[PDB]
Design a protein around this ligand. Structure first.
Ligand code: VO4
Ligand code: VO4
Ligand SMILES: [Br-]
Ligand SMILES: [Br-]
Ligand SMILES: [Ca+2]
Ligand SMILES: [Ca+2]
Lengths: 590, 590
């Protein structure tokens, strides 16, 4: 048939193949209508566990008008420009000047404006490749009264108080006290010590973590994430620089070969510096109740973080939070791809024309080569982000971890004033005694540094971002969804089973890379899974996503990338398939 | 209807839109069968002006067996891995070791292996987005006998002699001698001084260049590319760094804000260094006829280039040729996207939710925001590359500038031994008198520095690449096609009319950025088109593509990106359109 007709038939076949996977029914966990207003005469939902950021709140963190949130859900579902623009985002505005009235003196002094929701209607957007944004489902979110939410909040609080601790010094005497405290606190939760029971949802069993030790503290449960050093190589180490290529029998050593171990990627002919901007040690954000409520009222605190001069490799937990703050959602994975290409890590052996050119008489650049893997790893980003935008806005609308920190703060502060509100995070407040008193001390220090001479006790979750979380629900996680998608693309493309010869870890005292104490071996698949875990959990260290958000988002992104590869494989007429190890350990040939 | 069916219908509608565009019939120019063998008793085509790189050659630059090039063409048109694998790529091998027998002592001492064609079957590969690789056309390439090819090869030779010439010092007295020589030589060619006549094909009329001056020497004919400094800001300058964002009424200055004028992009939390690996100055490659024949015989000289320690901003023509060597084909364009995002340059005003979040109540990240353009400007790259592969392999198969230099050199050396071969490049040889004399001087210097004590006269085109051009025909150009596509995406996304306040240029005698003598105003569209011009003419400065290659490839990439944007706009249900200023002045709304 005609080439135009053949291409049209190929696109139609890809669309039909996307259809054949079907729409997995995505179920919310019901926190939207389960929690009602505590007022005896008001039966309207409190929407405390829903993503009520941007809508006006009272002094306690819930929305003053529930109909504000139903309008938000209607705008999400319809996606109309005017309907979204008609929402009551932000607090009451000053009639004379139009500036919204902020609770905190900081936001009022800054004369902050409101910030809108980040692409509420992106879930409704269709995709020309991969599964539709609504064609793939994520499991019901953890409930506020469930022990899983308690464990997630414990883990995030323990990252917040340990944002100044270094990844290389997790098992170090100086950080031993805090690391053991965090391990004991996590192992004291029903989620970690008690194993999954028969009859629980399969995703809940799959995403349930076991006993927390030093070797898996603040780590994901992806295969290869819990082995070797904490930081993935493709997040710290550079790459084989320009000029370090073997031509014929001889191999030239680039004069800039030291940049490979310095943490400098060979971004083609230029260099990507793996060193991250140094956010100020110990400066957490949204530790004040008024500032937290202003941020929940859509305070545009974006860019308010203070940074130290220069840049350094990821060493502290706050450094990883900064790394994932303005991450491009494929910056980490494009960096991994560039490292793999520069390092000479060959693609999947099942890809065509991967042999030495004496045999196949063909070099792979546009297809099954550098350009193809780069383009696929950065194009899996948009479809995955649309899928996670659907899972965030149109189904789950989970409250952000800063919102669950605010609920816990008001719950633990209410007895001090003789009140009692949010009997939903009561289990969390009871279970997080030591964690929440450490958090109270940390937030008192942070508020004293902020300018409050004697701040009231605040058990709010310390957060590395001035603006708090991005302005979309916590479940699922956009960076973890694109993590799963891009890392799955890279594992399908590159020979993911290849062991890494040089395992590098950041120095205890210096800003440079040294050989890790890990005497074992790490695969390329292991490194990419560790990088996906790193980028996902760096959001937890920012306090912007829970762990279950990260894991289920990684699985959803894995589905996104699998669908894209299945649809893309129809385009290439070569006999080939992607030997892709999934996040569950099984390998799917695409 | 159902959401799965709605998504299927949207994808089928994008496919139908690509189909209704219709296949534009892409005509070759006839070089394949027009030039016969000079042997009186052999009527087989010589294929001197077709892409015969890889196939065995004799001591003159043609293929010894033309029936080996028709096998290559059949492998191109079919696509089968097995058919490609049986081609006779490389020269006759050695029966005991297997390693091919080379002509040059360099390639034999290196013990090189053959290198394969870079995705010769990628043209047949379909896509799930944009125009098919065969649904759009490029005009026939200029013939060897044409005055255009004379101009392109003369300009590439002049670029090769002036690879040590600095962009900032084009209008400086230190290079004014060679610069004026180049201007006078280009103005002497019939292509430049004589204007396009009525009847001439519209594409050649459009791509014809006028009088060459300092301000347009070695520049493209894209809008805004000719005006301002040579280098585009989005190839030299960095971007507003992390921490420089303004919050409310208070603007923050980053502690490392001096990196935006240093040449250090804000790759989110990390930094992309705009500095480029310093290639060894003066050292050109493929200046010896034996080494050039070995490269034509598929000598894997990849990575053989020598580099100086450290890195510097693009300051010499060789530095731009090196910048585009390992370019990811969206490296420059991803850099431009990151610069534009970090600098705060607004997106297209016609995109939705682009207002201050107190009006639209929505922030754009996934769609019409950072992630959308960030991923489109790269996802366009592989579709553009498939289209240009088609154009390279299945239709045009234009010989590389190194191949045209080899023909010119053999033709000009034939009278020295009394022979007379390649009447086709006779006009190019006779017009290029002073240019080829300077080329002979430079090639003699390079061959003396390469080991030969008394090199034979060589008029070969000196090239900054040890492996020479990649293994695909020069027409069209992969990086120029992706330049057109990515710059078109960037202009359709960002507000291309935005005037750039700070226009910078590399210091004349230092590796740092200073303000430029350009007193006019430059736009985001101007610098994006200038960046596409920079990448394309940097491929030319490498001696791997002629100018018509770059310009028609840029037009093809513009076509690719318009098609991709048209099919994408169907997905987004928001009311919006891209205000895209095409490369021909006119603005298309998508
Ligand atoms: O969706 V996130 O703030 O990772
Ligand atoms: O096709 V190319 O830009 O060498
Ligand atoms: Br997101
Ligand atoms: Br290409
Ligand atoms: Ca190969
Ligand atoms: Ca907006």
């Amino acid at each position: 048939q005609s080439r135009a007709k053949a291409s049209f038939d190929t696109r139609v076949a890809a669309a039909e193949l996307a259809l054949n996977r079907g729409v997995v029914p995505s179920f919310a966990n019901g926190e939207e209508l389960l929690y009602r207003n505590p007022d005896p005469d008001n039966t309207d939902p409190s929407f405390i566990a829903s993503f009520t950021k941007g809508l006006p709140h009272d002094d306690n963190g819930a929305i003053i008008d529930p109909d504000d949130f139903l309008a938000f859900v209607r705008a999400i579902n319809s996606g109309d420009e005017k309907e979204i623009a008609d929402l009551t985002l932000g607090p009451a505005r000053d009639p004379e000047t139009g500036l919204p009235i902020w609770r905190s003196d900081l936001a009022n002094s800054l004369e902050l404006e409101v910030r809108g929701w980040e692409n509420s209607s992106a879930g409704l957007t269709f995709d020309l490749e991969g599964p539709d944004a609504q064609s793939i489902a994520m499991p019901p979110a953890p409930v506020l009264t469930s022990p899983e939410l308690v464990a997630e909040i414990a883990e995030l609080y323990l990252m917040a108080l340990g944002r100044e601790i270094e990844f290389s010094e997790f098992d170090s005497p100086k950080n031993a006290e805090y690391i053991q405290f965090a391990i004991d606190q996590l192992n004291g939760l029903e989620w970690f010590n008690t194993p999954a029971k028969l009859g629980d949802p399969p995703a809940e069993i799959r995403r349930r973590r076991g006993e927390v030790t030093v070797g898996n503290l603040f780590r994901g449960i992806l295969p290869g994430s819990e082995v070797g050093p904490y930081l993935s190589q493709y997040i710290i180490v550079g790459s084989k620089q320009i000029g370090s290529a073997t031509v014929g029998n001889k191999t030239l050593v680039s004069p800039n070969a030291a940049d490979e171990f310095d943490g400098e990627i060979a971004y083609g002919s230029i260099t990507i510096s793996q060193r991250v901007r140094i956010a100020t040690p110990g400066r957490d954000f949204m530790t004040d109740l008024k500032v937290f409520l202003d941020v929940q009222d859509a305070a545009d605190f974006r860019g308010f973080e203070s940074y130290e001069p220069g840049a350094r490799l990821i060493r502290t937990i706050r450094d990883l939070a900064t790394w994932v703050h303005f991450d491009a959602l494929y910056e980490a994975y494009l960096n991994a791809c560039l490292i793999l290409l520069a390092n000479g890590v060959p693609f999947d052996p099942n890809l065509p024309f991967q042999q030495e050119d004496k045999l196949d008489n063909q070099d792979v650049f546009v297809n099954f080569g550098s350009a193809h893997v780069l383009s696929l790893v950065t194009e899996v980003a948009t479809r995955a982000l649309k899928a996670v935008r659907y899972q965030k806005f149109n189904i789950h609308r989970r409250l952000r971890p800063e919102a669950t920190g605010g609920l816990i703060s008001v719950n633990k502060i209410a007895p001090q004033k003789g009140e009692s509100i949010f009997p939903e995070v009561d289990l969390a407040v009871e279970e997080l005694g030591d964690i929440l008193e450490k958090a109270e001390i940390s937030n008192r220090k942070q508020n004293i540094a902020d300018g409050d001479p004697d701040p009231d006790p605040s058990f709010l979750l310390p957060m590395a971002f001035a603006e708090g979380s991005p302005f979309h629900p916590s479940y699922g996680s956009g960076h973890a969804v694109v993590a799963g998608a891009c890392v799955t693309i890279l594992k399908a493309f590159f020979d993911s089973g290849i062991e890494i010869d040089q395992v590098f870890e950041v120095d205890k005292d210096e800003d440079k890379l040294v050989k890790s104490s890990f005497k074992g071996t790490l695969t390329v698949a292991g490194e990419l899974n560790k990088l996906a875990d790193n980028i996902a959990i760096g959001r937890n260290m920012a306090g912007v996503h829970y762990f279950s958000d990260q894991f289920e988002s990684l699985l959803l992104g894995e589905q996104v990338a699998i669908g894209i590869l299945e649809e893309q494989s129809l385009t290439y007429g070569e006999n080939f398939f992607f030997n892709l190890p999934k996040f569950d350990g099984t390998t799917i040939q695409i």
